[PDB]
Structure 1
Amino acid sequence: LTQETVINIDGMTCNSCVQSIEGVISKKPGVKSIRVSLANSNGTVEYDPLLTSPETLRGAIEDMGFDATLSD
């Protein structure tokens, strides 16, 4: 079964962030549906636990260069 994580992504300056983030993350193994937002400053990612995790996703966002932290 799949899970979904809301990662708060702060330091998003404009929609280039949205585009780049969703572009990169959509290609990660296990990822399915994705909804990244400038306005809400976050990334709502549906994923497969066995192939990726909230920490992996958060990690990648942090590597790109944003303040990536889980909603909980």
Structure 2
Amino acid sequence: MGDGVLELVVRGMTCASCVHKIESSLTKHRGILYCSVALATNKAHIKYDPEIIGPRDIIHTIESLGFEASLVKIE
């Protein structure tokens, strides 16, 4: 409920694959509330609370997995 939206533009990606890699991966952090990786806009719309997980924590994990990841925040 009004927790924290987090559009990371994920510079990299391709088609599928990278998508569910991100989604499946970061959802393992029990502070990610949701992970919509809009390939269409090369963007992880993550939903998270800042309290139990920092945005950088997720970002590190994303960039590490395949990418560069920048919290544009609704782009």
Question: Under TM normalisation by the shorter chain, which class is it?
Answer: 0.7 to 0.9
The aligned counterpart of 1:58 is: 59
Amino acid at match of 2:28: K
The aligned length equals 72
What runs of 5+ residues in structure 2 fail to find an aligned partner? none
Report 1:10-49 matches (<5 A).
Answer: 10-49=11-50
Amino acid at match of 1:70: L
* Aligned residues with identical type, % of pairs: 33
Q: Could you tell me whether the CA contact under 8 Å between 2:18 and 2:66 is conserved in 1? A: no
Give the secondary structure class of the aligned counterpart of 1:23.
helix
TM-score when normalising by structure 2 = 0.84
> What stretches of structure 1 move > 4 A for 4+ residues in a row?
none
Amino acid at match of 2:5: E
TM-score when normalising by structure 1 = 0.87
Aligned-residue Cα RMSD (Å) equals 1.4
Counterparts of 2:29 and 2:15 in 1: how far apart (Å)? 23
Q: Could you tell me whether the CA contact under 8 Å between 2:13 and 2:66 is conserved in 1? A: no
Counterparts of 1:27 and 1:11 in 2: how far apart (Å)? 21
Counterparts of 2:68 and 2:59 in 1: how far apart (Å)? 9
Counterparts of 1:22 and 1:48 in 2: how far apart (Å)? 17
